[PDB]
């Protein structure tokens, strides 16, 4: 039993909800919140920009130190950093950005990072400003993640379309 509330159960391990991931994180304080990161951990917009704003830019400060030490992530890769006031940890995961020409096959690799964590609150990778089809992203998530994933979907219209079209 965990503290996630009001989710629709999609499969054995995947749950979905129409919710702002920022407000969901602040209420649940999950062990792991997933950020829709880029390789430079520059959290300017989308889910990343919103999560960082909620940390009063502490996420960005921590991220800049991480990059200065380690260099950029790989597309499809991840790193674990602090969750600040939102979660114990933030798993920064880089899904491919279609608006940069990045290979969509890397979306499966991106979701594989979730399997290193027993329970996660996450957005749909490569959705929103990353330019991929959120329906496809959900399919890859379901077919790749084996740990317990709670998806927060910001747009109510998109949430209903995801549910109604789910196979
Ligand atoms: N669950 C959730 N998702 C977010 N994003 C941003 C927009 C897209 C649609 C294009 C990509 C995704 C929809 O879920 C993911 C945000 C941003 C702020 N808060 C959020 N909360």
Residue ranges per structural domain of the chain? 8-163
| Crossing angle between the packed helical segments 21-28 and 46-54, to the nearest 10 degrees | 40
Q: What are the distances in angstroms from CA 96 to CA 53, 71, 90, 132?
A: 23, 18, 19, 8
Cα–Cα distance, 105 to 87 (Å, whole number): 29
Please report, for the chain, how many H helices and E strands are present, in that order: 6, 7
Return the half-sphere exposure (C-beta side, CA atoms, 13 A cut-off) of residue 130: 32
Could you tell me how far CA 8 lies from the centroid of its own chain?
A: 18
Ligand 1 atom nearest the C-alpha of 158 is 13
CATH class of 8-163: alpha beta
Q: What is the resolution of this structure in A?
A: 1.0
Residue 79 CA to residue 60 CA, distance in Å, equals 14
How far does residue 115's CA lie from ligand 1's centre (Å)?
A: 21
CA distance 93 to 100: 16
């Amino acid at each position: 039993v965990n503290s996630f509330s009001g989710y629709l159960k999609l499969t054995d391990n995947v749950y979905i909800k129409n919710a702002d991931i920022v407000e969901e994180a602040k209420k649940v304080k999950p062990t792991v919140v997933v950020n829709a990161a880029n390789v430079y951990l520059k959290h300017g917009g989308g889910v990343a920009g919103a999560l960082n704003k909620a940390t009063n830019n502490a996420m960005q400060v921590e991220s800049d130190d991480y990059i200065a030490t380690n260099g950029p992530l790989k597309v499809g890769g991840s790193c674990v950093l602090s969750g600040h006031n939102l979660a114990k940890h933030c798993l920064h995961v880089v899904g491919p950005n279609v608006n940069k020409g990045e290979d969509i096959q890397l979306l499966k690799s991106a979701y594989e990072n979730f399997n290193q964590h027993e329970v996660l609150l996450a957005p749909l990778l490569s959705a929103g400003i990353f330019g991929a089809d959120p329906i496809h992203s959900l399919r890859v998530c379901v077919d790749t993640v084996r740990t317990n994933v709670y998806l927060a979907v910001f747009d109510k219209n998109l949430y209903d379309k995801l549910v109604s079209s789910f196979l």
